[PDB]
Structures are given as C-alpha cells and as structure tokens.
Amino acid sequence: GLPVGAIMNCADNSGARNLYIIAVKGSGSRLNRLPAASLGDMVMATVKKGKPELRKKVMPAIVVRQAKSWRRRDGVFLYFEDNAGVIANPKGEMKGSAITGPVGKECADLWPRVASNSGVVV
Amino acid sequence: MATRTQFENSNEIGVFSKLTNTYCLVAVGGSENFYSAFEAELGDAIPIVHTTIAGTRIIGRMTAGNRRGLLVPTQTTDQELQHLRNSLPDSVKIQRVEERLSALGNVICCNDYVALVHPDIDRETEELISDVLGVEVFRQTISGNILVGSYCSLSNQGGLVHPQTSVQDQEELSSLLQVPLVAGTVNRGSSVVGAGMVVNDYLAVTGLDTTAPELSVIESIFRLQD
C-alpha cells in the first residue's frame, strides 16, 4: 500500500517519529511502475523527525500497519488504522523492545523477532 | 539435558513452541524434524500438540499458560479451539481472552505459582490469569521492558532474564518470584531469552547458536543436571 516516497509511523520505542521510505527491497522491475511496500515488507526508510541521530540515515524497516484493504487467505478484507513500520537490522532482529499498536499477523509470521517484540498482534 | 534444536533454519524457539510441565505445543509448518526433536525429548510422557492459533505457526508468543491452564487470545478460531480441547486433557484449562492485544507469550510470563504480566494490562485478564492458571499475579517490568515473557523465562526451577536487568531489579523481582535469577544471553547475543528458549522443570530447549557458556548458565540456574 506504500510506494517509494511514503511517510509511515514508528511503532517501536527507539525514538523515531516517522519513517520515509526511499527504496523497497525485493521488488520487481517493470517500466513506469512503483515499488510498493505492504504488510510484512522490509524496505529502506529514512527518519524525517525525531532524534537527529536516527535522522539523516536510512535504516531497514518492516511494515506492521498498512491501512489499505488486502485479501487475507481466509475470506476477509481488512486494513489497519494507519501506516506504520518498525526499524531494525537487515537480520530482522528488532531495535525496539516493545512494539506498540497492532502488528499484522502475516508480518509476525514472517519475522520471529518482530513477533518476539510484538505486544499487539492484529 | 539441555538440547539445541532448530526450526526451519531459525534459532528462535519460544516463537513457534509453547512448553509447560504437562504438555507442549508445536507448529504444523515446514517439517516434522522439529516435532521429532521434541519426541526424542518428551516422548509419551506429556502430550505434544500440533496447533495453529488463528492460522499461525507462531504459538508460544500467542499463548500463555501453566500446567493447570492455558490462555488463548480472542482471535483463536473454534475449530482450532475444539482441537485444542479434544487434544489436551481435563487437567489443562483452555479459555479465549477478550482483550486488546493478542500476543500472550510476550505479555504473560508465569510458572505454576507466580505470573508476571504487562503492567498496563486490563483488569479482566488480570482476573482471568489468577483464576485459570491459579497463580499469583504481579504487574512488573523486567528492567523497564514492558514485554515480560520474551525478556524473562520462568519455571518452578528458577528464572532467566535478559542482560540489561539490574541486579537490584533481579532481587526486587526474585523476592516476588522466590526463585533465583541470572542475567543471561541466548542464541549468541540475543537478549530475547523467552522466545530464544523454552523451559519446564526438567527440560530447557534452545537454539543451535546458544553457546556453551549460555548453556552452562541455563544448566546452572534451571538445574538441568540432577
């Protein structure tokens, strides 16, 4: 639900306020299309506001809230209240200890450490 | 007795498994290698149950329970819930929890007597823990970390905490526990000790990357050798 150049929230307790995605890792290559992030996607994202130590530096981040209605495998169309991501290493191990807000079920199934720091699943 | 185990090329253990004294919950995903590993460990003594929780391989973070009870969140489907009820005997209690958050293995850590919880949990689940599990409930953070299960592993043997836990905090919390505590690493530097390994009163199961000093820590504080 988020293309390149999308401001999303920061649901961990690291100190960033918003995460500005500048690249999507693992996206296709088609002319004039945009690499689109979604739930359970690790993308390069830059911090716009917050601590300046987290600003001016891109970090990998996994998206936990999407707010665009997707088709889950069981029959339901559903979407979160907002767009939100949590910054982490490329190894998927979290930076934040507790992730606030609801985390997607596919995203927590994808990453064991995000689910280890997930408080609220869906 | 401490056994290194791997699930689908991942060192995390408490994410996909739920271990009590009287049963074990395992995922259905991938292969039966991880299930046969527990069969080599647990065998015919305690029932080991394949399950999903709202269609997940992740079940140890989703579930929080003791030998006497098991708490499941709201999203647990009644096909899964009836399979758990037909699976587990009458001595284990099962009940869905109508609450905001779903992940229980992050939020409730316990043993057969004492449970530490999320200090901002609702009061109804704080009721239901001491009702079903029959345990003592305490609102507490382990070193200011509000997720108490992934950062603190419990049994009736002892307890293990993440290394950022202060020794003042360890004594402050072990007075509530009446079982000892050690700041411990697991899976080569991963501070997440509750999802990195599971423990009950005779067994501690961790990942392959849990080093021999970490295994000595677990083998000391949970007394894996008799």
Added chain:
Amino acid sequence: LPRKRAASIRARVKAFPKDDRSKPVALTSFLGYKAGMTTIVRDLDRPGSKFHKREVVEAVTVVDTPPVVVVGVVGYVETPRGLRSLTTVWAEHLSDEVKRRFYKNWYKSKKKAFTKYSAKYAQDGAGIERELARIKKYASVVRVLVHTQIRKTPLAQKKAHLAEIQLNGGSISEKVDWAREHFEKTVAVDSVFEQNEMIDAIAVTKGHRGYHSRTSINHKIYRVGKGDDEANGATSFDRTKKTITPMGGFVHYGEIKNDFIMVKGCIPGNRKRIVTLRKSLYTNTSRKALEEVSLKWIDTASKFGKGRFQTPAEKHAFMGTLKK
C-alpha cells in the same frame, strides 16, 4: 497465432486421452453448460506450504450438467491417409431437439429427418446388425454419438447439441455392444467423472477479439452435485438444507435443477455456453492433482447486487416480519 474466429460455437475436441483397455467401457468427455461463478471456503491440505490446515477461499465455476443420452455410434478405421469413418449407426427414436439440429426450418418443415431409418428397425435389424458386426470386425477406434437434455435446462434454444466421444474402455465389440444397450438411454457424469478429477475445458471464449476455441487444462473438480439433492449447497460443516442455486439464481442464466460440476478456477467462455469437459490427457501427479479437497462452506448469495443472505429463511429470520 492468427486470431480468426471460431468455426462452431461448440468447440472441437482435437485430442482424446489414451486408451486403456484394461478399464471398463466408459466415456472420456462430456458437454455441459456453464451457469456462473461463486466462492468456496475449504481447508488446504498442503504440507510444504504455510497455508497447510488453513481455511482458503476459492473461486469456482459451476457448469450445469443435464444427463447426456447416447443415440448413435461411429467407428473409424485406419487408412494410410488417416482416420475415416466407414459408417455411422443411429438409434431409432430421436427427439425433436436432435431432429431440430439437422434442420434449419424446423418450424415449417415436414420433419422428415429419420423416417426411413426407422424402417431399419421395422426389420429384424439385419442391415443394422450387419453394420454393428462390421464395426466389431473393422473400425479400430470407436466414437459414440451423444446429445444433451436441453429441455431440462434454462437455455432458450430448444435445439440440443450432438457430439462424438472417443470411448477408451476395452474391447471394440464390447464397446459397440455397450453403446447398443446405451442407445436412447442416459448417462450421468457420476459414472464418468468423479470428485478431485483434474479435467480440461474446451470452450469458445467470449466474443465482443474473442470467440476463439480455447483448451484450459488441469482443473480439479470440486463437486459432482446430484440433481435430486436439496443439500447441493451443503457441506458436513454447512448443515443448511440449500441448493447450489444462488440467491435469485445464476445471473443471466437461470437455475440448476439438474446435476452440476463445480470445478476449480476459471474457464474460457461465458455463461449460457456449450462447454466440453474432458478428462486429462495424462495422469497428472503434481500433488496439485492428487489433492483430495474437503469443502467447508458454499456462497449462494446474490450476484445481482451486494448479497447479504444465503437462504431466504435466513433472510426472514434476520429481518423478522415486514409490513407486507
């Protein structure tokens, strides 16, 4: 390929599956009429997939299945120039659907189609039985002549469709004797097709580009539904007593009071269209072929609008009484 239009709207079957003469004498394809599409809840049994033992929702296509009846046979002998029918054999009593099919002006014809052929059973059958023994003797491969019960269908065309089916059972003599007993009698797909069968679909697609013969293969049959069942829309999970007919019925089609085949996926062609359901040209073993599916719930709501009920008894139960 150059995109020229289809020859006939009933698409041709250019190849049939392989003859096994160790199996009993049985058909290899069928002709039905697609009603429409709906959504099916079932559980996936796929180890190696993360969606194992998980509820999946799946789009299906349902083809109305009237029982098909055999009225003739055709034996082809091998020539060095190719396959050639030495003769065709008809039965005696043929419907006005089929006699209509030969005619262009049935409404004003004197309907003189197979009159003197009926004199060929006025005799003992000597010419006809000579021809049957000839097709026993010659004609290495056997095709049967079949047509549908189109009057049992909401199609406005009273003219049924005739087709050949290669008969891949054993014993050409037993084949033509099998067809001899099966003259003017019926065959349902329950003796031909079954649950979990990977089938191919041969159909002319939707013209507007379009109106082309297409063969879409590897589609698992999900339900061989019987016409007498009032629990067509039911499952062991879905204990409602309801049919496969949607709420308000199939859109622009009508209903299915007949048998039906609910098959996975999509299919070329539109509704109201004649479609050939052929069994697979080989034994697929892909584990997408071997899957014994188990349904859970059947959508039977309205596609004439945003539906909100499954049975009208459910509709009255929720809405209560009305002013009317």
Added chain:
Amino acid sequence: KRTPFIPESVKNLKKYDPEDPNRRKLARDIEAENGGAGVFNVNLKDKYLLEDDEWKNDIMPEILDGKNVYDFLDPEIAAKLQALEEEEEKLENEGFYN
C-alpha cells in the same frame, strides 16, 4: 510452598537412543515410510483423546441455517430446552397465539 513439577511418566520414560535397532519411532520415522519431508501429510484426528475413537473420525459442524453451531453447543442443552418448551406450552394455553 512451591515445588518443581516433574511427573513420574517423565522420569519413567527411557532416554531416546539415536543409534538403536529397537527404539521408539519419532515423527521422522513414520514420515520417511510414505515419502519424505514435504510430501508427508500430518494426521491430527487420530491422535487426540476422546470418549470414543469413532468420534475421532466424526465431524464438528460449523453453520446451521445461517447460524454458527459453536455458539449453540453447550453442556446440558436439554434442561434449558425443556424449560423453554414449558414456557411455550404456557404461551400456548394462555391463548396468546391466534
């Protein structure tokens, strides 16, 4: 007072031997018989305990008449239904229905 709880069936279980001609079968042991890793299929209905093993093969229904079966199934439905039927006998012989 608190104790570590290890059941006697845990201690009474023999230790699993990884190189043994006569040993307990694991999941890989039954798995390798019919196919291998991915193609093996897990059976859940056989394992769980019930009062009848034939009830292992039996099927929990989900939806009856547009209502969930799970919301209605209950310990002792019969006494509630009999008291309900007595209430309906009362609303009958009052003459409330006409």
Added chain:
Amino acid sequence: RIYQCHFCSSPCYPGHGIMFVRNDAKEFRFCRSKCHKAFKQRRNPRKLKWTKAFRKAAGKELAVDSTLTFAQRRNVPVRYNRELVATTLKAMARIEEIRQKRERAFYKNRMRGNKEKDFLRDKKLVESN
C-alpha cells in the same frame, strides 16, 4: 465463523464485507460498502432507520427472548461429544421456529390497536355534527 455486521448486525461471511482495525485492535466488520462508507462518515446507526440499531432501539421487533439464551460465544471449549451435536441441530431449528413465531405474534399485537384508535377517531368525525 459467522460474525455480525458492525453497522447492519447482518451475518458477515468469508468474502463478504470490509474490516476496519483501529489502533486499539478492535476489529469492525461491515457486510457491504454502504455500511463501510456509513462508518467512514462517523454516522450513527441509531439515526439510520433500516439498520438494526434503530429497529432494536425502536421496538419494531422484540429484542429479548428466552430463546436467545442459547446463542452465545463460549471461550472455554467443550470436548467433542457426537451425541450432543444432533441435539444442538434440533435445538437451532426448533428455537429459530419459536423465535419467528414469537416475532410474528409480537407484531400481531401492533395491528389490533389501530382498530381501537380508528374507532375513537371516527367517533370524533361523527359526534360533532
């Protein structure tokens, strides 16, 4: 599993309706986009006459019945009893019959009083002249 519509109270099914999840993890299922867009505009179903918030708030149908004591989500699961299953099936069919009978007979109370007030009001159109 059947859920209700948040805006209609209508039974929600797989493939039917849109779910919205707020930051406090509360799921709200809507049977259609009329319900969903009605929720988007922050509207009250007590204002819209057709949805069951108004109809159960209004008194068109009865809203509490002794038949309703049977339908409830139970968080403690029960072990499988095959012999209770057909009894629950008979219970669901019978109780739905009784519920429709009580609802129709409850509507039967409504139409008799208009006879009385039409009598009392057509006396006013006669007795003044």
Added chain:
RNA sequence: GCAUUGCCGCGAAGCUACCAUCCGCUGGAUUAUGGCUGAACGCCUCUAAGUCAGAAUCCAUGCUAGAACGCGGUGAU
C-alpha cells in the same frame, strides 16, 4: 434556459486490471561450443571406444486454423 455525466449520498450492469483470479515450468534426436575417462606416443589429450551438457536445427506430442477447386460417414429428397 443552463452547468461537456451540474454536484453529492448510496448503488447496479458491462468493459477492464498480478489492481482481481485461474491455467499453462510438452518430450526425444541434433550443430557449434564446453568437458570426462582414455590410449594411440610410458609426458600429454573432450575422441580413437564410450559419454555429459548444449542452437531458434529436425521429429514426436498438445494447442490454434482447416485445402474457400481436400476427403469421408450419415439423413431426407
């Protein structure tokens, strides 16, 4: 008299879309080329025996079309 579908609420039908879904990773023989073991020549070598991969080459299979001056079977006249 008008607003290039005057606007808006809520919606059809059709067209269309990895934006939604389904189905299709067809098999052999081959050229150039890259090799194996291996002598002929006690070193050495893709070749002499044999053999592995590999072109849009050739064949099979399937699909699409059907000689509009290709054909057959069958009906009534």
